[PDB]
Amino acid sequence: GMARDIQLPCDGDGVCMRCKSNPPPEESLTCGTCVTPWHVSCLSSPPKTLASTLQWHCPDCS
């Protein structure tokens, strides 16, 4: 997990607000509550189990 300070979501156009990159699908995670895309690389605690990755809840919703 990259972010040691505050974590930022994605653009809505698909750009990570933190690292200024457009994450590929293998690096993208959308929340199960607000459905906001997040760059999984720039998270503080990326999901570590398969179930946590499926029903993933973003840091703003957790």
Place this chain on the structure above:
Amino acid sequence: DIQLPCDGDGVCMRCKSNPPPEESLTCGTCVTPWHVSCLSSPPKTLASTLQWHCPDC
């Protein structure tokens, strides 16, 4: 050898159940849902889970 996906309604064609989101995995190429519980080899990394290719792909 007999890996079966989910129907349009959602009932898994290998266990006759409607899996929850914590047990549903949609393929990144043919956008077909699958029941991970009925999968022979579930994904092993985070990248293979985020962009998942179903057995038939």
